[PDB]
Design an enzyme around this catalytic site. Structure first.
Site, PDB file in Angstrom:
ATOM      1  N   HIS A  41     -10.371  -5.726  34.431  1.00  7.64           N
ATOM      2  CA  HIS A  41     -11.516  -5.888  33.529  1.00  7.64           C
ATOM      3  C   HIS A  41     -11.510  -4.875  32.391  1.00  7.64           C
ATOM      4  O   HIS A  41     -12.388  -4.944  31.521  1.00  7.64           O
ATOM      5  CB  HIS A  41     -12.851  -5.891  34.304  1.00  7.64           C
ATOM      6  CG  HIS A  41     -13.229  -4.597  34.951  1.00  7.64           C
ATOM      7  ND1 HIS A  41     -13.423  -3.430  34.245  1.00  7.64           N
ATOM      8  CD2 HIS A  41     -13.517  -4.307  36.242  1.00  7.64           C
ATOM      9  CE1 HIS A  41     -13.778  -2.467  35.078  1.00  7.64           C
ATOM     10  NE2 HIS A  41     -13.851  -2.976  36.295  1.00  7.64           N
ATOM     11  N   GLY A 143     -17.731   4.277  33.761  1.00 11.23           N
ATOM     12  CA  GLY A 143     -16.518   4.996  33.428  1.00 11.23           C
ATOM     13  C   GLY A 143     -15.643   5.364  34.611  1.00 11.23           C
ATOM     14  O   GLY A 143     -14.493   5.771  34.408  1.00 11.23           O
ATOM     15  N   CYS A 145     -14.471   3.348  36.970  1.00  6.64           N
ATOM     16  CA  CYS A 145     -13.580   2.301  37.442  1.00  6.64           C
ATOM     17  C   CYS A 145     -12.130   2.751  37.310  1.00  6.64           C
ATOM     18  O   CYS A 145     -11.759   3.476  36.381  1.00  6.64           O
ATOM     19  CB  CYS A 145     -13.823   1.009  36.667  1.00  6.64           C
ATOM     20  SG  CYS A 145     -15.490   0.316  36.868  1.00  6.64           S
TER      21      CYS A 145
HETATM   22  C1  LIG Z   1     -17.789   1.969  30.298  1.00  2.00           C
HETATM   23  C2  LIG Z   1     -19.012   1.289  30.766  1.00  2.00           C
HETATM   24  O1  LIG Z   1     -20.116   1.820  30.703  1.00  2.00           O
HETATM   25  O2  LIG Z   1     -18.847   0.049  31.260  1.00  2.00           O
HETATM   26  C3  LIG Z   1     -19.742  -0.407  32.281  1.00  2.00           C
HETATM   27  C4  LIG Z   1     -21.095  -0.825  31.674  1.00  2.00           C
HETATM   28  C5  LIG Z   1     -20.977  -2.327  31.499  1.00  2.00           C
HETATM   29  C6  LIG Z   1     -20.076  -2.537  30.259  1.00  2.00           C
HETATM   30  C7  LIG Z   1     -20.218  -2.730  32.816  1.00  2.00           C
HETATM   31  C8  LIG Z   1     -19.859  -4.218  32.752  1.00  2.00           C
HETATM   32  C9  LIG Z   1     -21.121  -5.099  32.659  1.00  2.00           C
HETATM   33  O3  LIG Z   1     -21.867  -4.981  33.826  1.00  2.00           O
HETATM   34  C10 LIG Z   1     -21.901  -4.672  31.393  1.00  2.00           C
HETATM   35  C11 LIG Z   1     -22.988  -5.643  30.830  1.00  2.00           C
HETATM   36  C12 LIG Z   1     -22.568  -5.940  29.369  1.00  2.00           C
HETATM   37  C13 LIG Z   1     -23.033  -6.977  31.591  1.00  2.00           C
HETATM   38  C14 LIG Z   1     -24.070  -7.930  30.996  1.00  2.00           C
HETATM   39  C15 LIG Z   1     -25.456  -7.300  31.057  1.00  2.00           C
HETATM   40  O4  LIG Z   1     -25.796  -7.076  32.390  1.00  2.00           O
HETATM   41  C16 LIG Z   1     -25.475  -5.956  30.309  1.00  2.00           C
HETATM   42  C17 LIG Z   1     -26.841  -5.305  30.498  1.00  2.00           C
HETATM   43  C18 LIG Z   1     -24.383  -5.011  30.839  1.00  2.00           C
HETATM   44  C19 LIG Z   1     -24.378  -3.670  30.063  1.00  2.00           C
HETATM   45  C20 LIG Z   1     -23.072  -2.876  30.115  1.00  2.00           C
HETATM   46  C21 LIG Z   1     -22.307  -3.134  31.418  1.00  2.00           C
HETATM   47  C22 LIG Z   1     -23.242  -2.669  32.595  1.00  2.00           C
HETATM   48  C23 LIG Z   1     -19.158  -1.664  32.916  1.00  2.00           C
HETATM   49  C24 LIG Z   1     -18.126  -1.614  33.745  1.00  2.00           C
HETATM   50  C25 LIG Z   1     -17.442  -2.810  34.299  1.00  2.00           C
HETATM   51  C26 LIG Z   1     -17.861  -3.070  35.722  1.00  2.00           C
HETATM   52  C27 LIG Z   1     -17.110  -4.280  36.187  1.00  2.00           C
HETATM   53  C28 LIG Z   1     -17.679  -5.480  36.330  1.00  2.00           C
HETATM   54  C29 LIG Z   1     -16.820  -6.610  36.773  1.00  2.00           C
HETATM   55  C30 LIG Z   1     -19.136  -5.728  36.074  1.00  2.00           C
HETATM   56  C31 LIG Z   1     -17.274  -0.373  33.733  1.00  2.00           C
HETATM   57  O5  LIG Z   1     -17.688   0.574  34.472  1.00  2.00           O
HETATM   58  O6  LIG Z   1     -16.269  -0.329  33.019  1.00  2.00           O
END
Ligand SMILES: CC(=O)O[C@H]1C[C@@]2(C)[C@@H](C[C@@H](O)[C@H]3[C@@]4(C)CC[C@@H](O)[C@@H](C)[C@@H]4CC[C@@]32C)/C1=C(\CCC=C(C)C)C(=O)O
Ligand SMILES: CC(=O)O[C@H]1C[C@@]2(C)[C@@H](C[C@@H](O)[C@H]3[C@@]4(C)CC[C@@H](O)[C@@H](C)[C@@H]4CC[C@@]32C)/C1=C(\CCC=C(C)C)C(=O)O
EC number: 3.4.19.12
Lengths: 305, 305
Positions: A41, A143, A145
Site C-alpha cells: 500500500h 508512519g 507500516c
Molecule cells: C502516513 C500516513 O499517515 O498514512 C496513514 C493515514 C492514512 C493515509 C492511512 C490510510 C487510510 O486509512 C487514510 C484515509 C485517507 C482513508 C480514507 C478516510 O478514512 C480518511 C479519513 C483517511 C485519512 C488518512 C489515512 C488514515 C495510512 C496508512 C495506511 C494504512 C493501510 C491501510 C490499508 C488503511 C499508513 O500508515 O501508511
C-alpha cells in the site's frame, strides 16, 4: 530472579530498516541482501485506499518511482515485483548489515518482538503475541507500516510479521514476509471486525510456572484436575482448549518445579473461578498470556544470542 | 494507537558489550572509546564476597589478569583503576562501534531500558524504573552483572545504570557509570533490606493520560480536587506526594487531552479509594507507574533515533 516482558535485542534488525517513498507516501522497508520488502500500500494515495486495484496501480510505477533511503544514503532500485501484499524492491547493493535470517509464518499464541520504526528510523522495541483472532496488540502510529516482528535463535533472525494496518478497534493487522495476511484481513480501508480475543491457555500456565520459579506461590492449591474437566472451565472463560500437545510442551517447567501440569491447571481453574482477590502475580493483577513456555525457559535460564 | 511498555532500540549498546574475566569470575563490561567499565566485584572470589577489601584485593591484580573479549577477539589491557564501585580497564583499541554517549545519574521515578547480557552477549531488552527506594525490579540471573541501563536521545546514549547485585527479596541494586550505588546499598553480601516501594504518582497520572489518548476513558469522572486534598489520599496509599513541579510536567498531556491535571488527580483518587471494579486500563488491572510523562509523549507522538 525477576520476570519481565522482554524483547530480543533489536540491533540485528535496526541495521535492516530503510525508508521507502512512492510519490508522497512514506513508510518503512526491510533491507535483506539486495531486496527491500515493504507493504504494497506504499503505492496507494489517500484516495486509493477505499478499494485499490494494486495490479492496476502498479502498472503506473517504475523502478525510479520507489525512493529507498538507508540512513543518509540513497539505494538504486533495479527491479520491483508484488508478492501477495508486499512489494519486493531489488536494489543494486546488498545490505552489508544483513544478519543470518529466515522468514517464518507463526501460529496464534506465539510471541515475537516488534521494532517500531518511523521514516526508516527505529523508535522502540516491545514484545507481542499473535492473538488467536490473528490480530496483535501493538503500539503503532501513522508512519509505522513496514515495521517488522521477529524472533532470534542465537545468530539467526526469524522474521514473522510486517505491519500493515490498524483496525477501527485499535488493534493491528499485518502479513508474514511473503505478504500473506495473518487472519482474514485485507489491505483495504473497509469494515473488518476482529473475532473473539481468546486467552492463550498454555501461555498463562507457563507464566504461572515462571511465577513459582521467581517466588510467587500463593496461588498454588491442594487440588488437581483432568484435561477434560479443566477445559469445561477454559471454555466458560473464553480460554483456548488445552491439549496434550500443550501439556507436553509444559513438561520441562513441570520438571524444574516439581509441579505436575494438571496440578497447575487446577490452580489456574481456581484463579478463573475466584479471581485473584486483590493479590498480584509477577507484578500483574490479571493472568498474563503473552509468554510462551519457550519464553519462560529462555528468560529463567539466560540464553544469549 | 495502542500503548506498550517499550524499550529503546538496543543496537547502539549491543555494540559496546564485552566479557570480562578476572581469575575465575566472568561478567559483562561496557566498552566505550578505549575504556571498559565493569563492576569491581569481578576481582572477588566466591569467598571474598562476605566483606571484601577491594583496595587490598586489587593490589594482587595486574593488567594481564583482566581478560577482555569482544565477541571473538581479545582486547589488550594497558591500565586499570577503581572508581568507587566500578573498574575502568584501559585497552589499546577504541571501540569502533562507540555511539555518542553520556553518563547520567537518574532520579527515582525515571525510567530506562536494560540490555540483559550474559558472557558479553545480549539476551534481551526491557524497560524499568528507578524505584523510590532506589532498587529496580529487573530480570537478572547469575552472570548478568555489568549489564547496563540507558536512555537514548536521538543519537546520544545516556548510560545511567550498571547492574551489581540481587537483594534477598529478589530486587536489584547497582550503580551509575561513575560507580556510585543508587540508594544505600554496598557491593557486599550482607543484610541490606529495601525501603518502602512507594508508587510514582506522576507516572500513574501520565499513564492515565495515555489511556485517555488511546481510547480507555471509563475512569474519567465528574470530580476535581486540590494538590493538598489529593496528597492526603496519596499518603494513605503509599503514593509519592504530588508537587507543582509534577503538575507542570503533566501540562502537555493536559493540553493534548483537554483534561486538567487536578481533574485527572480526582479520577486517580477515586481509583485508589474504590479500585478498578474488575475493569482494566491499557491492558492492566493495576495502576502502572513505570511510564514517565516524557515516555507517554514520546510513544504517543513517534519520536525516533
Ligand atoms: C502516513 C500516513 O499517515 O498514512 C496513514 C493515514 C492514512 C493515509 C492511512 C490510510 C487510510 O486509512 C487514510 C484515509 C485517507 C482513508 C480514507 C478516510 O478514512 C480518511 C479519513 C483517511 C485519512 C488518512 C489515512 C488514515 C495510512 C496508512 C495506511 C494504512 C493501510 C491501510 C490499508 C488503511 C499508513 O500508515 O501508511
Ligand atoms: C557468576 C556467578 O554465578 O556469580 C554469582 C553467584 C555468587 C558467586 C554471587 C556472589 C555471592 O553472592 C556468592 C556466594 C559465594 C556468597 C556467599 C554464600 O551466600 C554463597 C551461597 C554464595 C554462592 C555464589 C554467589 C551467590 C555472584 C555474583 C556477584 C553478586 C555481587 C555481590 C556483591 C553479591 C555475580 O553475579 O557475579
Amino acid at each position: 530472579s525477576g520476570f519481565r516482558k522482554m524483547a530480543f535485542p533489536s540491533g540485528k534488525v535496526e541495521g535492516c530498516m530503510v525508508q521507502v517513498t512512492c510519490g508522497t507516501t512514506t513508510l518503512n522497508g526491510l533491507w535483506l541482501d539486495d531486496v527491500v520488502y515493504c507493504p504494497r500500500h506504499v503505492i496507494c494515495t489517500s484516495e486509493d485506499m477505499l478499494n485499490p486495484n494494486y495490479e492496476d496501480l502498479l502498472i503506473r510505477k517504475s523502478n525510479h518511482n520507489f525512493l529507498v533511503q538507508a540512513g543518509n544514503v540513497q539505494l538504486r532500485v533495479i527491479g520491483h515485483s508484488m508478492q501477495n501484499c508486499v512489494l519486493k524492491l531489488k536494489v543494486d547493493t546488498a545490505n552489508p548489515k544483513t544478519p543470518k535470517y529466515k522468514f517464518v509464518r507463526i501460529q496464534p499464541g506465539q510471541t515475537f518482538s516488534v521494532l517500531a520504526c518511523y521514516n526508516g528510523s527505529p523508535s522502540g522495541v516491545y514484545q507481542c503475541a499473535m492473538r488467536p483472532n490473528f490480530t496483535i496488540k501493538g503500539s503503532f502510529l501513522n508512519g509505522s507500516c513496514g515495521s517488522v516482528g521477529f524472533n532470534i535463535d542465537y545468530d539467526c533472525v526469524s522474521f514473522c510479521y510486517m505491519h500493515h494496518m490498524e483496525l477501527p478497534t485499535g488493534v493491528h493487522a499485518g502479513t508474514d514476509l511473503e505478504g500473506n495476511f495473518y487472519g482474514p484481513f485485507v489491505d483495504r480501508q473497509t469494515a473488518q471486525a476482529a473475532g473473539t480475543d481468546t486467552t492463550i491457555t498454555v501461555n498463562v500456565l507457563a507464566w504461572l510456572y515462571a511465577a513459582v520459579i521467581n517466588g510467587d506461590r500463593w496461588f498454588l492449591n491442594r487440588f488437581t484436575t483432568t484435561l477434560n474437566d479443566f477445559n469445561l472451565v477454559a471454555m466458560k472463560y473464553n480460554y483456548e482448549p488445552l491439549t496434550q500437545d500443550h501439556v507436553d510442551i509444559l513438561g520441562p517447567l513441570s520438571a524444574q518445579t516439581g509441579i505436575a501440569v494438571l496440578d497447575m491447571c487446577a490452580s489456574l481453574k481456581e484463579l478463573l473461578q475466584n479471581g485473584m482477590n486483590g493479590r498480584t502475580i509477577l507484578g500483574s493483577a490479571l493472568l498474563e498470556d503473552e509468554f510462551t513456555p519457550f519464553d519462560v525457559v529462555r528468560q529463567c535460564s539466560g540464553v544469549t544470542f
